[PDB]
Design a protein around this ligand. Sequence first.
Ligand SMILES: Nc1ncnc2c1ncn2[C@@H]1O[C@H](COP(=O)(O)OP(=O)(O)NP(=O)(O)O)[C@@H](O)[C@H]1O
Ligand SMILES: Nc1ncnc2c1ncn2[C@@H]1O[C@H](COP(=O)(O)OP(=O)(O)NP(=O)(O)O)[C@@H](O)[C@H]1O
Ligand SMILES: N[C@@H](Cc1cccc2ccccc12)C(=O)O
Ligand SMILES: N[C@@H](Cc1cccc2ccccc12)C(=O)O
Ligand SMILES: [Mg+2]
Ligand SMILES: [Mg+2]
Ligand SMILES: [Mg+2]
Ligand SMILES: [Mg+2]
Lengths: 259, 259
Amino acid sequence: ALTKSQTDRLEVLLNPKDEISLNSGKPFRELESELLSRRKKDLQQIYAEERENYLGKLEREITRFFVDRGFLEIKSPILIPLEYIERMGIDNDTELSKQIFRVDKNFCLRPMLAPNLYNYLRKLDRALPDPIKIFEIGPCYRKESDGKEHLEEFTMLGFQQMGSGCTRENLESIITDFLNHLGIDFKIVGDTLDVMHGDLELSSAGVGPIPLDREWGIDKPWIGAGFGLERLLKVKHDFKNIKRAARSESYYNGISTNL
Amino acid sequence: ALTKSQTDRLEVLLNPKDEISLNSGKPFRELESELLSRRKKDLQQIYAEERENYLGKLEREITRFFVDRGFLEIKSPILIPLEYIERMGIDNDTELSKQIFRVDKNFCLRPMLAPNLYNYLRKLDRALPDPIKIFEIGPCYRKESDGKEHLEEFTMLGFQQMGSGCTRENLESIITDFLNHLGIDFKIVGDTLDVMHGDLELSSAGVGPIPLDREWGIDKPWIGAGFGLERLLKVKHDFKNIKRAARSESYYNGISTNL
Ligand SMILES: Nc1ncnc2c1ncn2[C@@H]1O[C@H](COP(=O)(O)OP(=O)(O)NP(=O)(O)O)[C@@H](O)[C@H]1O
Ligand SMILES: Nc1ncnc2c1ncn2[C@@H]1O[C@H](COP(=O)(O)OP(=O)(O)NP(=O)(O)O)[C@@H](O)[C@H]1O
Ligand SMILES: N[C@@H](Cc1cccc2ccccc12)C(=O)O
Ligand SMILES: N[C@@H](Cc1cccc2ccccc12)C(=O)O
Ligand SMILES: [Mg+2]
Ligand SMILES: [Mg+2]
Ligand SMILES: [Mg+2]
Ligand SMILES: [Mg+2]
């Protein structure tokens, strides 16, 4: 019989597509030698044929999608003024207030894209025609309890349209086309709405105006949504734990690097 | 005559390609109205035609280049254990020790890619054939004095080859092909070498083995280099200050967003 520790080790080495039964009575040392061999070949094939990282590749695919549909690609600071958090209505009452990674006296690691997108919408509205369509992909940081669905360092897609066409129907049509294009199953439940894969939250979307808009100098209708890229990789690759999709030293494209 | 403040305002609005003389005796309010109009049209053209961000686009171009030449694309944590810094030989004697953004008791924002690349080289050497070729693009953080060439939040390309072919000639050939492919003028001065554009440092490269390798479990020859992506955009777009190339709310593709 295998120990819990030995099975822990075997499951790090196991890929969702693997047809191997741990429970069959073969010895740990041999099961481990089989899986070690498969995982080295998986890396060898990636290195020989494609060489692209899942997270980077997904970011590039999402980028082409939104560029093609008319959204301006934004890259804004990751390290943001701590006052952007209070101005988002997060002031020691919300769960998120205690999730902030603080950096100096006045800065933090952004936990969300909304502040920077707000600022870009206000600024670009003096220069661009209606409607204004922007999106950003990049790192976000939140302290979390260990979870199968949570990382402290993750990657968020955020997009926002401001002006005409900001209806809930249009927002659902963007979400629907976007996830059908990546091959990710979902249902939309709900102005605020959530995009869910079973009990896993893929995204939270919203329809404005809302009263928070005036703190940021926004007085137009808008629609938007945020998606976590690692949750999407988790679903499309059927990973059991989101840390196989994360920026990490322990996993490459969901294959363990401790061989 | 224009005030220093009025010329400051005019130069934020001025693009390197602009053929405008501030010194000609026309009034601030009119010079500003001309430049405001040009800068809005620049944004309108980007929004109508391409919609890609300079930093993101450069990252994708560098990615294709290195993937095509056989380097595995890495995305590793940005928030790293503070002990990686001491293990890099930075222990309160180097300039870099005081440039570290510390996050908790035990973590920091990475100022460099070398620790994570080291760890990937050691790990992948059990699985991949010789030579091992990897690269990473992503955020790095250093506290800096205000400068025309320094950002506190920048983007670094790092690449490393381990094993056979790790000669200084091969390393120069990668650097040379890489910068000729992006259209960036340089000279290599020097095993440690620097890639310079005038007095601006584009990159620092190195040839191993070096004694530091054994702390990281490396005992093979290697070659590598690090490049700052914003320094490259600065040179190729002839920006005067690197903050036009940075992830920012003040500039989009080097065009001011305060119109
Ligand atoms: N810690 C995290 N790790 C990975 N993805 C995350 C994390 N937090 C949020 N996301 C993703 O970012 C999206 C938008 O953020 P948001 O709706 O504010 O998250 P959330 O409400 O905290 N979801 P959750 O914390 O799981 O109940 C979410 O729908 C997730 O897909
Ligand atoms: N603060 C910064 N802002 C932008 N790019 C940077 C910064 N620091 C380093 N880089 C880039 O990263 C490359 C590799 O890092 P490194 O050689 O350690 O920098 P460095 O020695 O501090 N250069 P410098 O500080 O300007 O004298 C450099 O050659 C630069 O192109
Ligand atoms: N709330 C997340 C996701 C997000 C990004 C941008 C716009 C959003 C609009 C509605 C709901 C979520 C949105 C964030 O602030 O990053
Ligand atoms: N020293 C920088 C640039 C760099 C990255 C990777 C490998 C390197 C090798 C030699 C010199 C610099 C290298 C860093 O640690 O990120
Ligand atoms: Mg949460
Ligand atoms: Mg939510
Ligand atoms: Mg320096
Ligand atoms: Mg240097």
